[PDB]
Amino acid sequence: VQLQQSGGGSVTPGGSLRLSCAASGSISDFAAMAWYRQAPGKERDWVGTIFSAGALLYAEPVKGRFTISRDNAKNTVYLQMNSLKPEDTAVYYCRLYAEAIYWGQGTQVTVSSAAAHHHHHH
């Protein structure tokens, strides 16, 4: 597999998360990494993109709530998401444009008061 996504989970309204998309390919082939959000039965909706030389492209609705960054040298891009609301519950996908174009397998984010319920774990 080319892309490994993680950093998702369940968080209460108001919280933040930082999704990660790690590519197994070479850092020199990186051209851009875009992020998309797909709410339950909704269409995949583009959120933003980071380019190799570091420019940051954000969709009109984002208005500063989400931050795209790249690890120094772990060939990984991050999407930090703040002030989460139940409406942000979705599967978040990264897409890499390098030597070839690849989709990630998605990361589920759930924003709910039930994120404060941990008895299944402990």
Residue numbers in the entry: 2 to 123
The authors write:
Dali homology searching had previously located a similar secondary structure within the Ebolavirus genus NP, two of the three alpha helices being identified as forming a dorsal “V”-like shelf and a much smaller, shallower basin, well upstream of the C-terminus. Here, we characterize a trio of semisynthetic anti-Ebolavirus sdAb previously selected on live virus preparations and known to recognize the C-terminal region of NP to define the determinants of cross-reactivity and specificity. X-ray diffraction was then used to solve crystal structures of sdAb–antigen complexes and unbound sdAbs. In our present study, we show the consequences of this FR interfacing in recontouring the sdAb surface to be more accommodating to undulating and convex antigenic landscapes, bypassing the need for a concave epitope.
We coexpressed the His6 tag–deficient sdAb with KIHis6-tagged NP C-termini in the E. coli periplasm to form antibody–antigen complexes in vivo and also used periplasmic expression to produce the His6-tagged sdAb alone to obtain the unbound forms of the antibodies. The noticeable shifts in the elution profiles for the sdAb–SB–NP complexes were rationalized by analytical SEC, where we purified individual components separately (these sdAbs were all His6 tagged), combined in the 1:1 M ratio or left individually for 1 h, and then injected into the column. Fig. 3c shows a model profile of globular sdAb ZC (13.4 kDa) migrating toward the size of hen egg lysozyme (HEL; 14.3 kDa), whereas the extended conformation of the EBOV NP634 (14.1 kDa) results in faster-than-predicted elution, although the final complex (27.5 kDa) migrates with carbonic anhydrase (CAH; 29 kDa). The lower EC50 of the sdAb ZC can be rationalized by the minimal restructuring evident between bound and unbound interface residues.
